[PDB]
Structures are given as C-alpha cells and as structure tokens.
C-alpha cells in the first residue's frame, strides 16, 4: 500500500501514491501535482 499524503516515506520516494512526492527535509508524502 503507497504512502498517502502527509505519511512517513521510505526515503528514495519508493512508496509515496500517484500525486505525492517524499520531502527531503521532512521525510513525508507532499503533494507533487
């Protein structure tokens, strides 16, 4: 199951859903669209 928005990623951006993006200083799913 992907990450939803505002959810902790693995850091490589490897599980954020369609439309998300990982932080680089958070480290969360963050709106990419």
Known sequence: ECKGFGK???PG?????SGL???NK???CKVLL
């Not at 951006?13 to 859903?17: A, D, L, R, V």
């Open 21 to 23: 993006t990982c932080s």
């Open 13 to 17: 951006k490897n599980e954020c859903c």
């Open 26 to 28: 958070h480290k969360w």
């Open 8 to 10: 902790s990623c693995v």
